[PDB]
Design a protein around this ligand. Structure first.
Ligand SMILES: COC(=O)[C@@H](NC(=O)c1nn(Cc2ccc(F)cc2)c2ccccc12)C(C)(C)C
Lengths: 193, 183, 280, 358
């Protein structure tokens, strides 16, 4: 009884992508599989649904045609084929199951896969020591910041998107070397404030 | 039909042991086909009550659901520190299924004033971005500006600190490099 | 050739009136049941219309030939007259075949109540109808060559052919009577099963029985001619029995087609709602 | 809680009903209890009656048989609701008392005790050409204002609800179904042995069904194909003792067995309604209105019960068929086949709610 989602990653706008939800302990005929997406800092939104016992397949009005939901009952898996992704499709996509007969809410959920549809290309961060330290022009996420190499009234503002497409974060400690690790670009920075 | 569900209030401050009530109003009539989810930060939602009155198997008995007309209510009789998350509201009678705006339950704490701090642009970043900082304040809402002129600034606030149940706002304003010495 | 002066005009007027009345009824029914919406696609309506047209054509041809025989005494030859007799037998055997089709359709409907949808349809119904018409026409034209000789009543027809045609018609009638008797038996059966169908089916069966009385004597006279063909007045008795058969032609389509209320007729609900009940 | 209510088009008579799914325990049926609110100023002298009919439309509704009615009414109960308690005093269920408290003093109860042995609400799939009332047994509660029982009831002052009679899976599963056969051909005096068995006896709708096939071919003949088919039998008793087999799921595996050999395997197949849409005459579980419902559930009729009254009895069977070769030194292209059948139950678990066509 563990639905697991996979296949989410950065895609250029207008591109394609495929999300796979593998269900363990569920029979695709006694359960209905739904895809629900949550935008960054926003409420849940229902994106698609498939019920194999009847063969029914529903989509949200905002994703008609662009999104196709299918099911491979042999592997007890559900697929969302997302084509022509606009910039408004960036979100965490969670896969949920509901009792096929007499739906009683979304019983089980997946862990959710991120999908970031942005035109910007992968880049490295720039560090400005302002004791506060700011990092700007970094994309994609995440970025790790450590004060005093992990031995330092410590606050770190969550990454905030910019219209330019790149991100920006900041860290402040009330009163060392601010080690910044940029995993998706594999970069290391160190500034002494 | 596209039924819009309004969940109110969009925020709450409550201490452990208090009664918390969140209401959900549906545009049209939904015949007891409403469910209440609970999503903690990061994790995925978790069903709490279905049919507007039943409890999912494995849910603490404190949570209760009630209906009256087209107004549904979720009540946590004795709030616990593990019950402070975002609670949603679904109406699964008509396709498409619609969720509420989401109600966030915070933890009540004594008012605390911020500590205004300023940071001019750095040489590397302004070879730019004036930084205003408020820390360990309450409530989340802040209506005090730093001495500078209102440009385009992106405000970022951290989650309620576990230690002191406080917040922190780190806003940055971008403008011309010649407007950094006047603040 | 044989027509008593007292019976001559009587049978002439009787035949004329019966033919006119039958053709009127059949024309009305076939016009009322052509191109319609639900009275066309249905196979039972198709069979009823086929019977009506067949019996109307048969009545017209038969009355024409009978008048030409007992008044004009044409007797043009043993072949052209045989052509008219072939037309008459074609029409009559087609009518009996359409009754048989209807009877089998009802029998299969009552044997498997849900089979009417899955065993009989518009295409298969017309296929069966054309099969029946094909066997009818081949039977009708078989005299057109096989009349080697015999027939005290019909001038230039074979003798074994008469027995064969009586046999086929008799077996079809036996099948029809068995079908409707079985239908009545099953009707009474479900009635007795469910009371833990009484008069309507009885009257319909009796109407069909009356049709058999109208049609039965013909075969009796044919078989008597086959065996004995000794007496003379039997020919006039057969003329009268054929008049009765024409009356069968009049009685049959109306009983089949006019006794349907829905066919004659062809020619505010609130919605459920809920409401709370205060907990006690 | 919630109580369903329907109103007569005239609006002067309303029927309040607690629920629309009345579970059928084999020993006894849950009573159909409800309330009727009338307008005494309107029914000055006429009485208000209520009836519970069990209609059955096995005959084609779109067609009609002359001089006969393919329909039937297995059960018809009557009760004189207004005036109140004319015949005798009857107990009121807590629901009826609550409704009487909620409604004024112009609301009166009605209660029906259905006899145990009666059909369950089943409807037959009509196909893509038919229309009108759905073929198959179904119940209805009709309340009307009439001066006498036999007087015609004007449709503008009578209200009819459609209720359902359903059965839920037995709590204690019975013995695991199993079957075995031994055929002997005219070629070799050795028996071809087949043995099949399901995982369990009671299956819930949508749950896959597993068949443990085991063949021992001691004969000199080779088996080409193995066919596993879940098929549905619908014993109808309108006019006869008809039988309507209809394969609801199939799987044809080309897993051969050599002569004097053995073959053990597990075949999994799930009957669902997605691919059985075109099969007219398939018995569905019964619907209040035009909606979607699963394949008809099995019927738990009491053993030794007379079958005469029963309208439609549904059952399921998994059939395992070995297509054994018939080739020889000199002969035709014949290919015989041995078969075995396994009965199982396809029902729902006992729920706390079952919304019919939400
Ligand atoms: C009464 O003087 C008749 O003989 C008239 N014919 C029939 O009365 C009559 N002719 N046929 C065709 C037929 C049957 C058996 C056979 F071996 C060869 C031909 C009929 C079929 C059914 C009912 C009446 C008739 C007639 C003068 C109009 C010709």
């Amino acid at each position: 009884v563990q639905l697991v989602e996979s296949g989410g990653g950065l895609v250029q706008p207008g591109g394609s992508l495929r999300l796979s939800c593998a269900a363990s302990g569920f029979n695709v005929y006694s359960s209905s599989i739904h895809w629900v997406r949550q935008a960054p800092g926003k409420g849940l939104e229902w994106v698609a649904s498939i019920s194999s016992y009847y063969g029914y397949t529903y989509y949200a009005d905002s994703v008609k045609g662009r999104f196709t939901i299918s099911a491979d009952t042999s592997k007890n898996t559900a697929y969302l084929q997302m084509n022509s992704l606009r910039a408004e499709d960036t979100a965490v996509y969670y896969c949920a199951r509901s009792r096929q007969f007499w739906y009683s809410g979304l019983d089980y959920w997946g862990q959710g896969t991120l999908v970031t549809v942005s035109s910007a290309s992968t880049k490295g961060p720039s560090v400005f020591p302002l004791l506060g330290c700011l990092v700007k022009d970094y994309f994609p996420e995440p970025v790790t910041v450590s004060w005093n190499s992990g031995a330092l009234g410590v606050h770190t503002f969550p990454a905030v998107l910019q219209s330019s497409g790149l991100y920006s974060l900041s860290s402040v400690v009330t009163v060392y070397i601010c080690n910044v690790n940029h995993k998706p670009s594999n970069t290391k920075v160190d500034k002494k404030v | 039909s596209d039924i819009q569900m309004t969940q109110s209030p969009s925020s709450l401050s409550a201490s452990v042991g208090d009664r918390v009530t969140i209401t959900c109003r549906a545009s049209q009539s939904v015949s007891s086909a409403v469910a209440w989810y609970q999503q903690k930060p990061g994790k995925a939602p978790k069903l709490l009550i279905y049919s507007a009155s039943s409890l999912y198997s494995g849910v603490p008995s404190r949570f209760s659901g009630s209906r009256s007309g087209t107004d549904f209510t979720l009540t946590i009789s004795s709030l616990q520190p593990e019950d402070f998350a975002t609670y949603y509201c679904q109406q699964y009678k008509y396709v498409p299924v619609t969720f509420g705006q989401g109600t966030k339950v915070e933890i009540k704490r004594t008012v605390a004033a911020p500590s205004v701090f300023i940071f001019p642009p750095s040489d590397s970043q302004l070879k730019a971005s004036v930084v205003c900082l408020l820390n360990n304040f309450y409530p989340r809402e802040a209506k005090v500006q730093w001495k500078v002129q209102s440009g385009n600034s992106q405000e970022s606030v951290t989650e309620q600190d576990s230690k002191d149940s406080t917040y922190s706002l780190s806003s940055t304003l971008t403008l011309s490099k010649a407007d950094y010495e006047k603040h | 050739m044989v027509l008593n002066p007292s019976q001559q005009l009587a049978i002439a007027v009787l035949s004329l009136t019966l033919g006119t009345f039958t053709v009127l009824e059949n024309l009305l029914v076939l016009c009322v049941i052509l191109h319609s919406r639900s009275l066309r696609c249905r196979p039972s309506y198709h069979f009823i219309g086929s019977l009506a047209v067949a019996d109307l054509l048969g009545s017209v041809i038969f009355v024409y030939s009978f008048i030409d025989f007992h008044v004009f005494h044409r007797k043009d030859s043993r072949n052209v007259f045989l052509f008219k007799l072939g037309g008459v037998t074609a029409s009559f055997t087609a009518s009996v075949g359409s009754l048989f089709l209807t009877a089998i359709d009802r029998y299969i409907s009552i044997h498997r109540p849900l089979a009417y949808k899955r065993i009989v349809t518009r295409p298969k119904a017309v296929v069966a109808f054309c099969l029946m018409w094909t066997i009818a026409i081949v039977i009708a034209v078989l005299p057109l060559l096989g009349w080697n000789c015999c027939s005290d009543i019909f001038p230039h027809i074979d003798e074994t052919y008469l027995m064969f045609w009586i046999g086929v018609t008799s077996v079809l009638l036996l099948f029809i009577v068995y079908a409707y008797m079985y239908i009545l038996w099953k009707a009474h059966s479900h009635a007795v099963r469910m009371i833990q169908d009484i008069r309507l089916a009885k009257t319909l069966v009796l109407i069909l029985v009356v049709l058999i009385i109208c049609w039965g004597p013909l075969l009796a006279i044919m078989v008597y001619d086959v065996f004995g063909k000794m007496n003379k007045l039997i020919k006039t008795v057969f003329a009268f029995c054929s008049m009765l058969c024409l009356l069968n032609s009049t009685v049959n389509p109306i009983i089949y087609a006019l006794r349907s209320k829905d066919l004659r007729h062809a020619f505010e609900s609130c919605t459920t709602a809920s409401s709370s009940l205060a907990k006690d | 809680t919630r109580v369903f209510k329907k109103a007569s088009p005239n609006g002067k008579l309303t029927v309040y009903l607690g629920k629309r799914d009345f579970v059928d325990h084999i020993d006894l049926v849950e009573p159909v209890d409800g309330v009727v609110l009338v307008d005494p100023e309107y029914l000055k002298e006429r009485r208000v009656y209520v009836t519970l009919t069990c209609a059955f439309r096995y005959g084609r509704e779109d067609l009609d048989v002359l001089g006969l009615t393919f329909r039937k009414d297995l059960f018809v109960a009557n009760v004189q609701s207004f005036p109140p308690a004319p015949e005798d005093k009857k107990p009121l269920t807590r629901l009826q008392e609550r409704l009487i408290k909620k409604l004024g003093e112009h609301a009166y109860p009605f209660t029906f005790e259905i006899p145990p042995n009666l059909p369950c609400s089943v409807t037959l799939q009509p196909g893509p050409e038919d229309t009108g009332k759905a073929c198959g047994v179904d119940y209805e509660v009709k309340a009307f204002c009439a001066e006498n029982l036999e007087e015609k009831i004007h449709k503008r002052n009578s209200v009819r609800l459609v209720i359902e009679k359903v059965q839920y899976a037995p709590e204690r599963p019975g013995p695991q179904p199993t079957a075995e056969t031994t055929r002997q051909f005219l070629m070799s005096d050795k028996p071809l042995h087949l043995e099949a068995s399901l995982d369990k006896e009671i299956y819930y709708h949508g749950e896959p069904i597993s068949v443990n096939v085991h063949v021992t071919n001691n004969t000199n003949k080779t088996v080409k194909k193995i066919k596993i088919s879940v098929r549905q039998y619908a014993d109808i008793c309108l006019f006869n003792t008809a039988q309507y087999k209809c394969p609801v799921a199939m799987e044809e595996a080309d897993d051969t067995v050599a002569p004097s050999s053995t073959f053990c395997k597990v075949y999994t197949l799930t009957p669902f309604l997605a691919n059985n849409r075109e099969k007219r005459g398939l018995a569905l579980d019964g619907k209040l209105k035009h909606e979607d419902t699963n394949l008809a559930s099995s019927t738990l009729l009491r053993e030794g019960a007379n079958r005469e009254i029963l309208g439609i009895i549904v059952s399921y069977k998994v059939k395992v068929k070995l297509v054994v070769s018939r080739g020889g030194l000199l002969g035709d292209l014949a290919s015989s086949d041995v078969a075995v059948e396994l009965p199982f139950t396809l029902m729902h678990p006992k729920p706390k709610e079952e919304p019919p066509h939400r």
